């Protein structure tokens, strides 16, 4: 048992026809103080898989070192570790779900919320999420904490069922994700203007971008609201 100190934030993810799109901000929050802005939330393991997690910053660094050690172990005595055999998202997902379960059962869990997005070698997209309590489920749209009831109503309209996946393009998914991130920045105190967006695709490979902010924000309607109530001026 422990109390998280430097809390994370929401991480948004949703799949499309040619892959999955995941996005997250860059901000570390200590209570009500926004300490770190250079904190990274997406750690691309391999080329066809990106994992986005939230929680205690020490915990994300611990999980990151776990992922690096896992990659080092996979690289051992494997001549096909580069092209044929690769760390597909399912393997790493159930690995960190298992380690999360062992941490929980020992009664010293790690405050975390892990989302893994990847494309199988056969072309099938993978998207699943696991928390510190170890609950696992695969949905076309996932989010974290505050965003769980926040981003889902936005991302679920474009893609709602499995039949919607082939009908959604990468550009539509990207604009839906950026609109969602705009909404979270509008309505979540733990996010910042800066964010990070990652695109995975079975054809163009991994696409990861840094230094992404939120533009196209409307605020000219806030100068026509005067007072908290009966006050007019």
């Amino acid at each position: 048992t422990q109390q998280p100190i430097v809390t994370g934030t929401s991480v948004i993810s949703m799949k499309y026809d040619n892959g999955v799109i995941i996005a997250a901000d860059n901000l570390g929050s200590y209570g009500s103080l926004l300490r770190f802005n250079g904190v990274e939330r997406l750690i691309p393991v391999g080329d066809n898989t990106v994992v986005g997690i939230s929680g205690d910053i020490s915990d994300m660094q611990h999980i990151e070192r776990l992922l690096k050690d896992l990659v080092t172990e996979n690289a051992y005595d494997n001549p096909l570790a580069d092209a044929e055999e690769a760390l597909e998202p399912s393997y790493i997902f159930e690995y960190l779900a298992t380690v999360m379960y062992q941490r929980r059962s020992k009664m010293n869990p790690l405050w975390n919320a892990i989302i893994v997005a990847g494309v199988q070698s056969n072309g099938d997209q993978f998207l699943r999420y696991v928390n510190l309590l170890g609950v696992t489920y695969s949905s076309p749209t996932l989010a974290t904490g505050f965003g769980a009831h926040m981003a889902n109503p936005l991302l679920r309209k474009v893609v709602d069922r499995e039949s919607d996946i082939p009908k959604t393009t990468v550009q539509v998914a990207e604009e839906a994700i950026v609109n969602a991130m705009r909404v979270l920045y509008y309505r979540d105190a733990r996010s910042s203007r800066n964010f990070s967006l990652a695109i995975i695709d079975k054809n163009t490979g991994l696409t990861f971008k840094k230094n992404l902010q939120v533009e196209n924000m409307k605020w000219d309607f806030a100068k026509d609201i005067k007072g908290y109530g009966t006050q007019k001026i």
Binding site: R65, K68, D69, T72, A75, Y76, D77, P79
Partner: protein, 140 residues
Amino acid sequence: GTGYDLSNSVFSPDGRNFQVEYAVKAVENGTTSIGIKCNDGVVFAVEKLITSKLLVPQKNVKIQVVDRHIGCVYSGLIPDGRHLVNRGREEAASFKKLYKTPIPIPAFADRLGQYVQAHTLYNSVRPFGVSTIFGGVDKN
């Protein structure tokens, strides 16, 4: 007295350990393996002997990799070198876990040498019969 080569830690009258010498003589009965220290890095090489053609080509390998920048090429008792490189990989993993810096080559050398000599101090352990040409590139 006779039997100065039966055990391991026993010293010969001239002061030379005998099981280690026999391990050295066992090393030479192995596939040749060279390594060149070029200016920027290192270049290993092995001569894995093709037995009866039933063996699959280009599949059995002997250049084992440690972490990313340390390579291990071994000759002699191949399994013994397998175990040695396994322990070396564990040491490199521990170092990167608790220092988060890739293990420098001399440090890996110190770790492997200390492990190797740990097996030629006792009477209840056979000395390693593998010679390695391990090397790689580091910050320096």
